[PDB]
Design goal:
Strand order of the largest sheet of chain A: 1-9-8-5
Radius of gyration of chain A: 20 Å
CATH superfamily of the largest domain in chain A: Type I PLP-dependent aspartate aminotransferase-like (Major domain)
Shape of chain A: globular
Number of helices of chain A: 14
CATH class of the largest domain in chain A: Alpha Beta
Number of strands of chain A: 13
Bound molecules: ligand 2QR
Largest interface: A-B, 53 and 53 residues
Number of domains of chain A: 2
Strand content of chain A: 5-15%
Structural class of chain A: alpha/beta
Oligomer: homodimer
Order of helices and strands of chain A: HHEHEHEHEHEEEEEHHHEEEHHHHEH
CATH topology of the largest domain in chain A: Aspartate Aminotransferase, domain 2
CATH architecture of the largest domain in chain A: 3-Layer(aba) Sandwich
């Protein structure tokens, strides 16, 4: 059979149609479809303002930039995340303060966050990992208590809910429209916020810092209507798309009961899982093989897998900048985690092909 | 009749088809179509390496970043240009050194460049204005003599030639795939260079600074294959598309002989005009009306126009940062220039509608 990648975008007739209307219109860059997408995300989350951007990385950049973060400022973040967050902190001239995460949910804890707080802390950046939400009640309380803004990394959390409310409903959250995200337009993102002054700054910084004329220099991070229209078509399918992911995640849960591999633990609080990823831990002790070996073997069997992620602080630049930094739970998982196939268009043929491969390598 | 904008993208069946193959493929982000586009631009220009990016602004950012430009460093650039170049210089922490341009070609002169050179100069950034090339022989000589890298702003110059050779054939040039550019994919750009070490740095800085792992923090500026495929379809039509622009520019030249308005002067050297814009000067003295009045009147007649550009140093942030800065030729034109309709799909009905409007407001 053909290669089974660990993810595929759910592109259909709606996506192609959306593009066609934009191309035929002549207005292919930022315009009406961007306004519609922003208005739509406000309706999805329950928030008041939304700013569409070229990527969630870009969203993180202008979000932190809008806060005036720079020299001498600290930003608390997990090491277990995508390198984008760490890079934007550094490139702004600020100091990344990496903290550890829960050993089984891979989510940053209020404990580890609070212990790292200093008068130089200008932001706390939690990650709604794999689609599951973090402990926002506790983390928000830390923010209001110490007076530190909270910028939520919701790159995995489109459709995620935390204690009855959508992620992005309150505060500030940054979603991703990357190829493998729940909804996609190849590359894109959106910042949702409740602060009108903050939103105006984002809107400015994403487009040359114009109002027109330059008021304060900004970057070019605007999302074309070409892509926005695709993200809109996807957003209409969101509940359906996530339902498929959820259904498949359930089937994984069953098969894993008779497998040595350890899926992530669900958060203890009320939530709705967007199921962007299905991560398993591969401990050589109880599995008989290393995670690297498993990924190489699955590949031989024509099955793709992901690595989300190898901790940022174990990568070259951050190894050399923070030699002393130790994060045991982060490091433990980082050496053992990998992402199994999970995408809306995945079939039972595809699913059973994975489990058959997993039993074959185990034993 | 309907509104006649001053530009429209030439979207056809090829563009829609290109998108469809990408969507159907499942690989919608950076991939094969990006490689093809880079290889194609190398074939167009005659250069050896090309790096596709999310925008020409983004290209300018990583280009200057790759040079190590930062605190204390100066960058010579015209004020008569798009605010993007000035913003990227500043946001890097470097100092923009704005210099004047030729009164009739709006191109930066070797004279003004050389006079502003100092041991802090780390880059010279000429602009191939409106599609016409700058005096590269002189400017390159300045670069090699003083040991200053030259980064060419070719946002208007896709298809432009200078003394028998394509723009981008040598050194470093940054092209734009913006909506109104000669070729477009809504938003996009590409850096073409002859330096292999330099190109590797760009390739890294446009994608998180990865090789993988982070070697040195970078931004997210990668172009999706979705858009790259559109840029490829356009690139195949380039000569045809520019021929239409050129043909229309010829018709403007005729009508302007019997009009008080002053088109830009052509460069004195051998060249091929890409004709991205057709700019005219509107001097209240010999025209009877101001440029602002003309644009407002043409709009009433359902005819759109452009302003490329109001000098960067007359915009708020740069007014306050450089109060003493005076650039007479830049300022003179900046108050009098505007861009008339010019796009491949423009008809004779559209053209004659402009000239009829121009004679009506003159007299
Ligand atoms: C010298 C130089 N250096 C760097 C850059 C930046 O490159 P980059 O942009 O790739 O990063 C540029 C690019 N600048 C261009 C891009 O940004 C600006 O363009 P813009 O914001 O759009 O607005 P306009 O000029 O006035 O054109 C808009 C019109 O156009 C019509 N229109 C507009 C959009 C659309 O989708 N369809 C359409 O018909 C439509 O008719 C619309 O009215 C500049 O004016 C343009 O000149 C540059 O000229
Ligand atoms: C917590 C957090 N914060 C911020 C961000 C950044 O957001 P932003 O990206 O919007 O700026 C992210 C996003 N990170 C994602 C984007 O970048 C990385 O993705 P990636 O570079 O692609 O590679 P992979 O993960 O391994 O997936 C690739 C696979 O996927 C398959 N594939 C790939 C492309 C495609 O077009 N089609 C396809 O089937 C195809 O099967 C391919 O093999 C991360 O791993 C992804 O997790 C994040 O997770």
């Amino acid at each position: 059979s053909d290669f089974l990648p660990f993810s595929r975008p759910a592109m259909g007739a709606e996506e192609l149609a959306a593009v066609k209307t934009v191309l035929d219109s002549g207005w292919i860059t930022t315009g009406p479809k961007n306004q519609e997408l922003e208005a739509a995300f406000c309706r999805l989350t329950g928030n008041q303002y939304a700013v569409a951007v070229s990527s969630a990385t870009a969203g993180m950049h202008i979000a932190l930039m809008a806060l005036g973060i720079g020299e001498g400022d600290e930003v608390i973040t997990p090491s277990m995340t995508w390198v984008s967050t760490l890079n934007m902190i550094v490139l702004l001239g600020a100091n990344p303060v990496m903290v550890d995460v829960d050993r089984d949910t891979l989510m940053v804890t209020p404990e580890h966050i609070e212990a790292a707080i200093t008068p130089q802390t200008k932001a706390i950046i939690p990650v709604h990992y794999a689609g599951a939400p973090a402990d926002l009640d506790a983390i928000y309380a830390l923010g209001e208590r110490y007076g530190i803004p909270v910028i939520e990394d919701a790159a995995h959390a489109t459709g995620t809910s935390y204690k009855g409310r959508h992620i992005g409903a309150r505060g500030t959250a940054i979603f991703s429209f990357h190829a493998i995200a729940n909804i996609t337009c190849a590359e894109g993102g959106i910042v949702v916020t409740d602060n009108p002054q903050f939103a105006d700054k984002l809107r400015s910084l994403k487009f040359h810092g114009l109002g027109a004329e330059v008021l304060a220099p900004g970057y070019k991070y605007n999302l074309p209507d070409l892509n926005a229209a695709i993200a809109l078509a996807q957003l209409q399918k969101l509940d359906a798309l996530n339902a498929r992911r959820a259904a498949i995640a359930a089937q994984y849960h069953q098969a894993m009961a008779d497998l040595p591999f350890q899926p992530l633990s669900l958060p203890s609080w009320e939530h709705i899982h967007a199921w962007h990823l299905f991560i398993i831990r591969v401990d050589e002790a109880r599995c008989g093989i290393t995670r690297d070996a498993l990924m190489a073997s699955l590949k031989t069997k024509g099955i793709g897998t992901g690595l989300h992620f190898r901790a940022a602080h174990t990568q070259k630049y951050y190894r050399e900048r923070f030699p002393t930094l130790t994060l045991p739970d982060t490091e433990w998982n980082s050496e053992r985690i990998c992402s199994l196939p999970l995408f809306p268009d995945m079939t039972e043929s595809d699913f059973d092909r994975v489990i058959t491969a997993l039993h074959q390598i185990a034993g």
